[PDB]
Amino acid sequence: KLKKVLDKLRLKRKDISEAAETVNKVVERLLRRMQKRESEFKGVEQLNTGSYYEHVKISAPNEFDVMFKLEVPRIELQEYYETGAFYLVKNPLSHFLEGEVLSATKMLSKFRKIIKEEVKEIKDIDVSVEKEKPGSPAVTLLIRNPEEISVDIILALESKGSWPISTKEGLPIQGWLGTKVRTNLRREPFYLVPKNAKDGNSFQGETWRLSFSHTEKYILNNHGIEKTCCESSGAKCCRKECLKLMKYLLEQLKKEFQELDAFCSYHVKTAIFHMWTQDPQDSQWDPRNLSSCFDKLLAFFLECLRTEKLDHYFIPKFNLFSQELIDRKSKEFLSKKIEYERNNGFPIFDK
Amino acid sequence: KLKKVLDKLRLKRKDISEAAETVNKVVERLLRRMQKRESEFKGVEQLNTGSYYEHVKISAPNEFDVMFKLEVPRIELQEYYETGAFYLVKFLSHFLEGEVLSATKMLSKFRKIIKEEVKEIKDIDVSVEKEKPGSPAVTLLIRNPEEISVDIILALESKGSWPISTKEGLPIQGWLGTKVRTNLRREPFYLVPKNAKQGETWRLSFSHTEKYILNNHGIEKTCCESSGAKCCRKECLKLMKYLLEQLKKEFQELDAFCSYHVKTAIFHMWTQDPQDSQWDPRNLSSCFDKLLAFFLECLRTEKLDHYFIPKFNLFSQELIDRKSKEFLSKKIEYERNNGFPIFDK
DNA sequence: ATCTGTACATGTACAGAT
DNA sequence: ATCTGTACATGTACAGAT
DNA sequence: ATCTGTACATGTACAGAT
DNA sequence: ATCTGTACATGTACAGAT
Ligand SMILES: Nc1ncnc2c1ncn2[C@@H]1O[C@H](COP(=O)(O)CP(=O)(O)OP(=O)(O)O)[C@@H](O)[C@H]1O
Ligand SMILES: Nc1ncnc2c1ncn2[C@@H]1O[C@H](COP(=O)(O)CP(=O)(O)OP(=O)(O)O)[C@@H](O)[C@H]1O
Ligand SMILES: [Mn+2]
Ligand SMILES: [Mn+2]
Ligand SMILES: [Mn+2]
Ligand SMILES: [Mn+2]
Ligand SMILES: [Zn+2]
Ligand SMILES: [Zn+2]
């Protein structure tokens, strides 16, 4: 029943194969262009992230996320007004500086210009660059070989120092993945992507946001308290399956209802990270109990909506569901929709 | 009772501190000599190994193992007979015996250098132990004034795929898992100048892999961590090591046995019984008793396969006589059936 | 002659197809 | 249950640069 | 190239709580 | 007796400086 829904959401190998071949060609060509001698982005490296590379993409392989990450040694960070997530950042990049402050907007604008130039010279493939969207750190490619595929090329600064202080009590995996895992994860770099809002606030053009997309990918692919969870000599859990179901519920509601424009799949991802922390035992995600596991995720998400509280998993003081970011009305609208589907056998899964 | 024995075997923080301070001085000075000096071993790097660095040393901090590992440009290995563990090495040109990199020549120069440097140490009472023909180590004897031995082990580091003899080894797939096993086998492998029984042959070492396993020994990621549950795996290893050590002190008949037999056996047992709840501290007695039963079965079948190299039998007749295994069997069974009176010594 | 940034070589987990 | 395409970590060969 | 600084894992040690 | 919290000690991966 839920299993039949998962059957419908499963990607097909033929679609995967055809989509990846084209995405890989485009991305490699753009990455090579970035290495040309006079490029401010020479030395940028690729990191594939997001649902496709975590194996939780649903319905079709039609949206791919790729970070083009540039190491920026000897950075000093200044927190933007105690928000925990947003920072000012203070030589190939000297053209993007205003005094000692690195402009996210100048740097993103040049990045976009280079990508557009290279895209125009692709005659192989039907590909174009989507109009910039406010609040996005990405240059998005629209590929039509024939099926529509979007690729988000995300500009990111790489810093190898210790993670900012706002993350100190974040990543609360000690009871689940453990202390050695958390220590090792926090020794990896952290990333900053352009905030890129057009909201008339101070430093609009120069504000960067923390990204832990690499850490999140690791977690999704190494998600059990037991080392053998979902391995060929261990037991299958239903953690990724619950994430896929919850993502589908949101995707379906969002297609129908403009009232839900403020919500995105990262809200669901964040909520399930909290549930995986609350219920760390693999036996609490037994496949035989798929319905009750999905049901408890739903109940948890409803509580987050109704109490207006969903803390960023890495930055606990940052509340993704504050009234400042999302209206009461929107949260209540979504709450009623979720409770309806839950209590009437998920008719939206049949559409 | 077993817990009281463990209390006696526990190292004291003050002894640890005093022993490590002296060991670290001597080791650092030898490692530095191997460098800025125009030695064939320039670029050798330190890797601490064995029971002290795995936190399973018992009784006193009086025996330390250190590898001085040298990366060597793509070598070619030829298995010695079909021993699995021993190899001739081809492509430091000073250490060739017509094209083969001689374990004896290379170890001899290494040992010469260490001896020379040791003679110039004036602040610490340290000497080099007479060479043992079976040993890949240059062994130091420190009087601190307590007696401390340090094994400085020369090792070639190779970054290639592990040799074919290890293909079915490291059988951790059901315990630590496939990602762990794959990642482990992506690390280098080591060759130490332990001769086959000759002079040119080298032997495989996985001391780095063994150390990782002892530090990451649970099916659960949180085993023995501050937000997980304590298991009794290392405590059973300590107890079994002490039983062998005590029997070996009393009976010369047991000279062919060593702690690495016990280590190998418990690796096998941890693979057979992977679940952390099968090693609950409340069940220390049962756990130690099943380790004993397992070891007795290894003795009775004359079979103890190297954990990494399955065709290498540490209990073959060629290495250990039938009578020696039977002698040990009887001793172990006596201690087991009389409540371990040797633990009270 | 050597050095090297770039891309191929090797190996296998994950999960879809049969 | 087996077979099989993709992703990806790490080793290494080498055209072009020095 | 080498070396120090940081962070926190692994331990010992012991009082107070359970 | 064990568990839990704090203090005190060593080992170790790796960034950044030199
Ligand atoms: N607001 C945010 N805060 C932190 N990280 C974010 C974020 N938005 C996106 N990300 C990161 O960037 C990745 C890609 O984002 P999206 O493409 O928008 C979604 P997704 O996780 O890939 O699933 P989907 O594309 O199937 O909906 C996320 O997986 C997450 O790691
Ligand atoms: N026969 C062998 N084969 C492979 N590796 C061996 C070996 N003998 C010793 N080693 C490696 O070298 C390490 C140190 O060896 P030893 O000092 O002889 C023992 P130990 O494991 O340190 O315990 P112990 O010194 O408390 O008795 C071992 O732990 C192992 O990793
Ligand atoms: Mn995505
Ligand atoms: Mn995206
Ligand atoms: Mn030792
Ligand atoms: Mn030794
Ligand atoms: Zn799982
Ligand atoms: Zn444990």
Tokens of B14: 């003050």
Q: Of A266, A253, A219, whose CA–CA distance to A239 is shortest?
A: A219
Strand, coil or helix: what is A330?
helix
Tokens of A294: 């999905």
A 10 A CB-CB count for A175 gives 17
* CA angle at B255 for the pair B253 and B258, rounded to the nearest 5°: 130
DSSP A67-135: EEEEE--S--EEESTT-SSEEEE--TTGGGEETTEE-HHHHHHHHHHHHHHHHHT--SS-EEE----TT
- Distance (Å) from CA B56 to ligand 1 centroid: 45
Residue that the structure tokens 């770099």 belong to: A189
* Residues B100 and B90 sit within 8 Å (Cβ to Cβ): yes
A 10 A CB-CB count for A329 gives 9
- CB A183 within 7 Å, strand E: yes
Tokens of B189: 């492998």
- Distance (Å) from CA B232 to ligand 8 centroid: 7
CB of residue A214 inside a 6 A radius of ligand 1? no
What are the backbone angles phi and psi of residue A241, rounded to the nearest 5°? -65, -40
Alpha carbons B31 and B47: distance in angstroms, whole number: 11
Smallest-distance ligand from the CA of A180? 8
User: Side chain identity at B283, as an amino acid letter?
Assistant: N
Q: Of A284, A326, A289, whose CA–CA distance to A308 is shortest?
A: A326
Preceding amide of A347 cis, omega within 30: no
Residue nearest to nucleotide D4 (CA to C1'): A13
Q: Are strands B63-71 and B76-79 parallel, antiparallel or unpaired?
A: unpaired
Alpha carbons A272 and A270: distance in angstroms, whole number: 6
CB of residue A340 inside a 6 A radius of ligand 1? no
Count the helix, strand and coil residues of chain B and give each as a percent rounded to the nearest 5: 45, 20, 40
Residue that the structure tokens 């004896």 belong to: B104
Rounded to the nearest angstrom, the minimum Cα separation between A246 and chain B is 27
* Residues A155 and A137 sit within 8 Å (Cβ to Cβ): yes
Alpha carbons B150 and B159: distance in angstroms, whole number: 27
The answer to whether the CB atoms of B221 and A227 lie below 8 A apart is yes
All residues at 6 or more sequence positions from A331 whose CB lies less than 8 Å from its CB, including other chains: A305, A306, A308, A321
Tokens of B50: 């064995």
Query: Mutate which of A226, A236, A282, A283 to disrupt the B interface (most B C-beta within 10 Å)?
Result: A226
Q: Of A153, A151, A154, A152, whose CA–CA distance to A22 is shortest?
A: A151
User: Side chain identity at A292, as an amino acid letter?
Assistant: S
Strand, coil or helix: what is B88?
strand
**What is the dihedral angle through the alpha carbons of B214, B219, B180, B137, rounded to the nearest 10 degrees?**
10
CB of residue B65 inside a 6 A radius of ligand 2? yes
Q: Of A185, A282, A299, whose CA–CA distance to A239 is shortest?
A: A282
A 10 A CB-CB count for A50 gives 21
Alpha carbons B256 and B315: distance in angstroms, whole number: 10
**What is the dihedral angle through the alpha carbons of B73, B79, B83, B86, rounded to the nearest 10 degrees?**
-30
Chain breaks in chain A (C to N over 2.5 A) after: 90
Alpha carbons A177 and B177: distance in angstroms, whole number: 15
The answer to whether the CB atoms of B179 and A227 lie below 8 A apart is yes
Binding-site annotation: residue ranges of A: 49, 51, 63, 65, 135, 152, 195, 209-216, 223, 229-230, 237, 247, 265-269
> Which nucleotide is closest to B226, CA to C1'?
E9
Alpha carbons A250 and A267: distance in angstroms, whole number: 10
Alpha carbons A75 and A210: distance in angstroms, whole number: 14
Alpha carbons B213 and B266: distance in angstroms, whole number: 12
DSSP A28-77: HHHHHHTTSTT-TTTT-EEEEESHHHHT---SSS-EEEEEEEEE--S--E
* Residues A254 and A263 sit within 8 Å (Cβ to Cβ): yes
CB of residue A57 inside a 6 A radius of ligand 1? yes
* Residues B31 and B68 sit within 8 Å (Cβ to Cβ): yes
Any idea what DSSP says for residue A350? Answer: G
Instruction: Please compute Rg for chain B using Cα positions.
Output: 21
**What is the dihedral angle through the alpha carbons of A87, A88, A94, A98, rounded to the nearest 10 degrees?**
150
A 10 A CB-CB count for A157 gives 23
Q: Is the dihedral of CA B313, B315, B316, B318 positive or negative?
A: positive
Tokens of A79: 């927190």
* Residues B193 and B154 sit within 8 Å (Cβ to Cβ): yes
The answer to whether the CB atoms of A226 and B216 lie below 8 A apart is no
> Which nucleotide is closest to A23, CA to C1'?
D6
DSSP B2-66: HHHHHHHHSPPHHHHHHHHHHHHHHHHHHHHHTTTTT-TTTT-EEEEEHHHHTT---SSS-EEEE
Tokens of B231: 């298991």
Residue that the structure tokens 């950042």 belong to: A89
Smallest-distance ligand from the CA of B149? 6
| Residue nearest ligand 2's atom 8 by CA | B260
Q: Of B128, B124, B103, B145, whose CA–CA distance to B25 is shortest?
A: B124
Q: Is the dihedral of CA A86, A134, A26, A35 positive or negative?
A: negative
The separation, in Å, between residue A232 CA and nucleotide D2 C1' comes to 13
> Which residues of chain A does B220 touch, with a Cβ-Cβ cutoff of 8 Å?
178, 225-227
B21: exposed, middle or buried (Cβ count in 10 Å: 0-12, 13-18, 19+): exposed
Tokens of B271: 């693979």
A 10 A CB-CB count for B340 gives 19
Smallest-distance ligand from the CA of B67? 2
| Residue B204 annotated in ligand binding | yes
A 10 A CB-CB count for B223 gives 19
Of all atoms in ligand 1, which is nearest to the CA of residue A314?
4
The separation, in Å, between residue B187 CA and nucleotide C11 C1' comes to 13
Alpha carbons A262 and A327: distance in angstroms, whole number: 9
Q: Of A311, A312, A102, whose CA–CA distance to A210 is shortest?
A: A312
* Residues B321 and B256 sit within 8 Å (Cβ to Cβ): yes
* Per-residue CA distances from A216 to A64, A165, A239, B196 (Å): 15, 19, 14, 49
Strand, coil or helix: what is B123?
coil
- CB B55 within 7 Å, strand E: yes
Alpha carbons A85 and A164: distance in angstroms, whole number: 9
Q: Are strands B63-71 and B45-49 parallel, antiparallel or unpaired?
A: antiparallel
DSSP A249-282: HHHHHHHH-GGGTT--HHHHHHHHHHHHHHS--G
What are the backbone angles phi and psi of residue B300, rounded to the nearest 5°? -70, -35
Mutate to test the pocket of ligand 2, among B260, B262, B305 (most ligand atoms within 8 A of CB): B260
Widest Cα–Cα separation across chain A: 61
| Residue nearest ligand 1's atom 5 by CA | A211
Q: Which positions in strand E are less than 7 Å from the protein's CB atoms?
A: 2-3, 6-13
By CA distance, what is A282's nearest residue in B? Answer: B220
Residue nearest to nucleotide D7 (CA to C1'): A53
Alpha carbons A294 and A283: distance in angstroms, whole number: 14
* Residues B90 and B78 sit within 8 Å (Cβ to Cβ): yes
Tokens of B99: 């094209």
Q: Of A120, A91, A104, whose CA–CA distance to A154 is shortest?
A: A104
Q: Of A46, A44, A160, whose CA–CA distance to A92 is shortest?
A: A44
Alpha carbons A44 and A40: distance in angstroms, whole number: 9
* Residues B218 and A180 sit within 8 Å (Cβ to Cβ): no
* Per-residue CA distances from B83 to A26, B91, B197, B202, B256 (Å): 51, 21, 11, 12, 19
- Distance (Å) from CA A175 to ligand 2 centroid: 33
- Method used to solve the structure: X-ray
The separation, in Å, between residue B129 CA and nucleotide F14 C1' comes to 36
The answer to whether the CB atoms of A178 and B219 lie below 8 A apart is no
What are the backbone angles phi and psi of residue B311, rounded to the nearest 5°? -80, -5
Alpha carbons A171 and A181: distance in angstroms, whole number: 11
* Residues A137 and A111 sit within 8 Å (Cβ to Cβ): no
By CA distance, what is B177's nearest residue in A? Answer: A228
| Residue nearest ligand 1's atom 31 by CA | A213
The separation, in Å, between residue A232 CA and nucleotide D1 C1' comes to 13
The domain locations on chain A are: 1-11+163-189+212-351, 12-162+190-211
A 10 A CB-CB count for B222 gives 22
- Distance (Å) from CA B226 to ligand 8 centroid: 11
By CA distance, what is A223's nearest residue in B? Answer: B221
Alpha carbons A64 and A153: distance in angstroms, whole number: 9
* CA angle at A199 for the pair A196 and A201, rounded to the nearest 5°: 95
3-state secondary structure B165-224: HHCCCCCCCCCCCHHHHHHHHHCCEEEECCCCCCCCCEEEECHHHHHHHHHCCCCECCCC
- Resolution in units of Å: 2.0
* Residues B110 and B138 sit within 8 Å (Cβ to Cβ): yes
Of all atoms in ligand 1, which is nearest to the CA of residue A210?
4
* CA angle at B18 for the pair B13 and B20, rounded to the nearest 5°: 90
All residues at 6 or more sequence positions from A132 whose CB lies less than 8 Å from its CB, including other chains: A112, A139
Alpha carbons A73 and A71: distance in angstroms, whole number: 6
Q: Is the dihedral of CA B272, B275, B277, B279 positive or negative?
A: positive
* Residues B153 and B66 sit within 8 Å (Cβ to Cβ): yes
Q: Of A6, A1, A3, whose CA–CA distance to A247 is shortest?
A: A6
Of all atoms in ligand 2, which is nearest to the CA of residue B210?
31
Helices then strands, each counted (H, E), chain A: 10, 11
Strands (E) located in A160-282? 190-194, 208-211
The answer to whether the CB atoms of A232 and B178 lie below 8 A apart is yes
